[PDB]
Scaffold this active site. Sequence first.
Site, PDB file in Angstrom:
ATOM      1  N   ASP A   1     -53.807  10.217  47.468  1.00 25.47           N
ATOM      2  CA  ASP A   1     -53.897  11.128  48.594  1.00 25.47           C
ATOM      3  C   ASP A   1     -53.501  10.411  49.888  1.00 25.47           C
ATOM      4  OD1 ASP A   1     -54.677  13.474  50.008  1.00 25.47           O
ATOM      5  OD2 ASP A   1     -56.655  12.570  50.336  1.00 25.47           O
TER       6      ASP A   1
ATOM      7  N   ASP B   1     -60.022  12.144  48.894  1.00 30.36           N
ATOM      8  CA  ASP B   1     -61.323  12.267  49.557  1.00 30.36           C
ATOM      9  C   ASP B   1     -61.900  13.679  49.622  1.00 30.36           C
ATOM     10  OD1 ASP B   1     -59.201  12.721  51.428  1.00 30.36           O
ATOM     11  OD2 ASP B   1     -60.726  12.851  52.999  1.00 30.36           O
TER      12      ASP B   1
ATOM     13  N   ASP C   1     -54.084  11.767  53.767  1.00 35.61           N
ATOM     14  CA  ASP C   1     -55.136  11.848  54.781  1.00 35.61           C
ATOM     15  C   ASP C   1     -56.497  11.459  54.212  1.00 35.61           C
ATOM     16  OD1 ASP C   1     -53.607  12.876  57.057  1.00 35.61           O
ATOM     17  OD2 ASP C   1     -53.349  14.678  55.821  1.00 35.61           O
TER      18      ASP C   1
HETATM   19  C1  LIG Z   1     -56.583  16.853  55.321  1.00 32.27           C
HETATM   20  C2  LIG Z   1     -57.680  17.535  56.321  1.00 32.27           C
HETATM   21  C3  LIG Z   1     -57.217  18.563  57.161  1.00 32.27           C
HETATM   22  N1  LIG Z   1     -58.255  19.118  58.028  1.00 32.27           N
HETATM   23  C4  LIG Z   1     -57.913  20.190  58.967  1.00 32.27           C
HETATM   24  C5  LIG Z   1     -56.511  20.543  59.209  1.00 32.27           C
HETATM   25  C6  LIG Z   1     -56.318  21.930  58.920  1.00 32.27           C
HETATM   26  O1  LIG Z   1     -55.677  21.945  57.653  1.00 32.27           O
HETATM   27  C7  LIG Z   1     -55.725  23.054  56.725  1.00 32.27           C
HETATM   28  C8  LIG Z   1     -55.364  22.820  55.237  1.00 32.27           C
HETATM   29  C9  LIG Z   1     -56.021  23.558  54.129  1.00 32.27           C
HETATM   30  C10 LIG Z   1     -55.591  23.249  52.812  1.00 32.27           C
HETATM   31  C11 LIG Z   1     -54.561  22.267  52.485  1.00 32.27           C
HETATM   32  C12 LIG Z   1     -53.947  21.563  53.702  1.00 32.27           C
HETATM   33  C13 LIG Z   1     -54.306  21.803  55.010  1.00 32.27           C
HETATM   34  P1  LIG Z   1     -54.560  24.414  57.414  1.00 32.27           P
HETATM   35  O2  LIG Z   1     -55.051  25.604  56.484  1.00 32.27           O
HETATM   36  O3  LIG Z   1     -54.835  24.752  58.869  1.00 32.27           O
HETATM   37  O4  LIG Z   1     -53.180  24.062  57.039  1.00 32.27           O
HETATM   38  O5  LIG Z   1     -57.056  23.579  56.666  1.00 32.27           O
HETATM   39  C14 LIG Z   1     -57.669  23.516  57.999  1.00 32.27           C
HETATM   40  C15 LIG Z   1     -57.631  22.353  58.881  1.00 32.27           C
HETATM   41  O6  LIG Z   1     -58.544  21.361  58.510  1.00 32.27           O
HETATM   42  C16 LIG Z   1     -59.598  18.693  58.050  1.00 32.27           C
HETATM   43  O7  LIG Z   1     -60.488  19.144  58.771  1.00 32.27           O
HETATM   44  N2  LIG Z   1     -59.965  17.683  57.195  1.00 32.27           N
HETATM   45  C17 LIG Z   1     -59.097  17.117  56.377  1.00 32.27           C
HETATM   46  O8  LIG Z   1     -59.484  16.185  55.610  1.00 32.27           O
HETATM   47 MG   LIG Z   2     -57.387  13.660  52.008  1.00 32.67          MG
END
Ligand SMILES: Cc1cn([C@H]2C[C@H]3O[C@](c4ccccc4)(P(=O)(O)O)OC[C@H]3O2)c(=O)[nH]c1=O
Ligand SMILES: [Mg+2]
Length: 194
Positions: A8, A143, A10
């Site tokens: 992964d 994670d 992030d």
């Molecule tokens: C990797 C990560 C992103 N975010 C953020 C960034 C944004 O990413 C998604 C999102 C949902 C599903 C797959 C990819 C992105 P979005 O649906 O907006 O693409 O879901 C909501 C948001 O949450 C966090 O809070 N914690 C994290 O560990």
């Molecule tokens: Mg991650």
Amino acid sequence: RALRVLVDMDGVLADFEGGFLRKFRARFPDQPFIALEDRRGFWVSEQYGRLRPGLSEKAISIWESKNFFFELEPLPGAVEAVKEMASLQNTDVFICTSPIKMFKYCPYEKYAWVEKYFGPDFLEQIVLTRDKTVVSADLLIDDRPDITGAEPTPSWEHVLFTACHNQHLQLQPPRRRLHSWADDWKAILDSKRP
Ligand SMILES: Cc1cn([C@H]2C[C@H]3O[C@](c4ccccc4)(P(=O)(O)O)OC[C@H]3O2)c(=O)[nH]c1=O
Ligand SMILES: [Mg+2]
């Protein structure tokens, strides 16, 4: 046959939590924030939304901003560990990451980030998908506690990489963790080899 490992991005390779906090405090200095030690739950905006009204929208503007993903710092030992892992015999490593919905900068910056820390040749190992269950492998180091999608029975074993937001979570056997890149990741990979 080679062992295939999905790593992964992030929260495992790139410090999303630390980068978010730093930029949130810099852009919204007069707003309350959440110390990493106090982070709970995968979704940052959700805990911020509970902190005070309007913090959710502000949190979102942080990761939707240009250079947010590109400027994330690598987690300690992450680059070193993945480089070594990829060089191991009978071992194929892929970086499997889910881009956010706003696609203006995220996809581009993730490729740029990988080029920066792993070099041009590693770009071939990148898989961008919002559904990791359709990617086949022996292991997925990620994670996020809940990894679901179109495939009800993924071929990989999900090893939970520790992060501030999941550190206190009790996992149901035989689910396990990789506590950090300083932890014995080679032992985990070997347990999956023939
Ligand atoms: C990797 C990560 C992103 N975010 C953020 C960034 C944004 O990413 C998604 C999102 C949902 C599903 C797959 C990819 C992105 P979005 O649906 O907006 O693409 O879901 C909501 C948001 O949450 C966090 O809070 N914690 C994290 O560990
Ligand atoms: Mg991650």
